[PDB]
Design a protein around this ligand. Structure first.
Ligand SMILES: O=C(O)c1ccc(Nc2nc(-c3ccccc3)cs2)cc1
Length: 327
C-alpha cells in the first residue's frame, strides 16, 4: 500500500480548533432577503453554478450573485463555512449575504463586485514587474487560507479576479475548497486538467496545501513563457505525459517509488523515457523580457513532482524574484 504523507506546515491547525470551526455539517445558515437583489445579466455558467451581475437596490451597490446547481447544493455548508472563516483575509473574496433563490430553490451566494479583465487578454499582456506584483498578491491569499487550515484545490487564471485599473486582486470560487486533516485521504477529482498536480494524476489521495503551489507554478510558467496553458494535455493521462516531457521520467519514477505508488499500467505504452529540460528551451524573442535567473529559480522550486519538496506560500514570498516588488 501507499506510504502516508503529512503537510510540512500548518499540520495540526484543525486538530486544536473547536469542532464548530471545521465541522461544516453542523453549521446553521442565516438566510437573508432575496428581494434585496435585482439581477442585471448572466456573467457565466459552470457545471456547479450560474453567476450573475446584480444590484443591491437598498444602497445601489453592484454585487455578484452565484446561484448553485442542485449537484453543488449538497455541499453548500462546506463553501459557506470556509467563506465565513476566511472573510476579511488578504485578497480573499468577501461573502456579503446568503439567500434562497426563488426559481432554483437552491442557495445563492452574494459577493462583493470586482471589475475583472479577461485573463485571455490580461495575463498574457502583463509586464515583468506586473507578473511579480500579481503573483505576490496571490501568495498573500494562499498563505492566509493554508494558515487557517484550508486547501483551495482549484487555483487557475479564471479563479483570480483582477481590477488592473485599481491593481486589486481577489481569489474566488471556494466551491472545491476543503479543511486539511492530517492522514485524511481526499478525492483526486479536483482542479482543472491543466493545473492538476502529479499527486492527482497518479491517484495519490493523501495530499495537502502543496497541491495549490503546483497549480500556482503552472500559472507562472504560462505568464513568463507566453504559452497558454503551459502543460496542454488532451486528457488526464496525456496531462502526466506533457509534464514528463519537461520535468523528465527519472524524477517521476523516484516520486512514485518514494510513496510506494503503483502507476496505472496504461502509462507503460505512453510515458516513454525523457530527460529533464533546461528552461532556456522555452525562452524566445517574444518572451525573453519576462524571463530572469530569479524567475527560473522560483519556477524550479514550485514545479517539483514531490509535493513535500515544493516551496510553501510563506517561503515563496521570501524569494529573490519578489525583491523588486514594492512592499
Ligand atoms: O466565489 C465565486 O465563485 C465568485 C466570486 C466572485 C465572482 N465575480 C465575478 N465573476 C465574474 C464572471 C464569472 C463567470 C464568467 C465571467 C465572469 C465576473 S465578476 C465570481 C465568482
Amino acid at each position: 500500500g501507499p506510504v502516508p504523507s503529512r503537510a510540512r506546515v500548518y499540520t495540526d491547525v484543525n486538530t486544536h480548533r473547536p469542532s464548530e470551526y471545521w465541522d461544516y455539517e453542523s453549521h446553521v445558515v442565516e438566510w437573508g432577503n432575496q428581494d434585496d437583489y435585482q439581477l442585471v445579466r448572466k456573467l457565466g455558467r459552470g457545471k456547479y453554478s450560474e453567476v450573475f451581475e446584480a444590484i443591491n437596490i437598498t444602497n445601489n451597490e453592484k454585487v455578484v450573485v452565484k446561484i448553485l446547481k442542485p449537484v453543488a447544493a449538497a455541499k453548500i455548508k462546506r463553501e459557506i463555512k470556509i467563506l465565513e472563516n476566511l472573510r476579511g483575509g488578504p485578497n480573499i473574496i468577501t461573502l456579503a449575504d446568503i439567500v434562497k433563490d426563488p426559481v432554483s430553490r437552491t442557495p445563492a451566494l452574494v459577493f462583493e463586485h470586482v471589475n475583472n479583465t479577461d485573463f485571455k487578454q490580461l495575463y498574457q499582456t502583463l509586464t515583468d514587474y506586473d507578473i511579480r506584483f500579481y503573483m505576490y498578491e496571490i501568495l498573500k491569499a494562499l498563505d492566509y487560507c493554508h494558515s487557517m487550515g484550508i486547501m483551495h484545490r482549484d487555483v487557475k487564471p479564471h479563479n483570480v479576479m483582477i481590477d488592473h485599473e485599481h491593481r486589486k486582486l481577489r481569489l474566488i470560487d471556494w466551491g472545491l475548497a476543503e479543511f486539511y486533516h492530517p492522514g485524511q485521504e481526499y478525492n483526486v477529482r479536483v482542479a482543472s486538467r491543466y493545473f492538476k498536480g502529479p499527486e492527482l494524476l497518479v491517484d495519490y489521495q493523501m495530499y495537502d496545501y502543496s497541491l495549490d503551489m503546483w497549480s500556482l507554478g503552472c500559472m507562472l510558467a504560462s505568464m513568463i513563457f507566453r504559452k497558454e496553458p503551459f502543460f496542454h494535455g488532451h486528457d488526464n493521462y496525456d496531462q502526466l505525459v506533457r509534464i514528463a516531457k519537461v520535468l523528465g521520467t527519472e524524477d517521476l519514477y523516484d516520486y512514485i517509488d518514494k510513496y510506494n505508488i503503483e502507476l496505472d499500467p496504461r502509462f507503460n505504452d505512453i510515458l516513454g523515457r525523457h530527460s529533464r529540460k533546461r528552461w532556456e528551451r522555452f525562452v524566445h524573442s517574444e518572451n525573453q523580457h519576462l524571463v530572469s535567473p530569479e524567475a527560473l529559480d522560483f519556477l524550479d522550486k514550485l514545479l517539483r513532482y514531490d509535493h513535500q519538496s515544493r516551496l510553501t506560500a510563506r517561503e515563496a514570498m521570501e524569494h529573490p524574484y519578489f525583491y523588486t516588488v514594492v512592499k
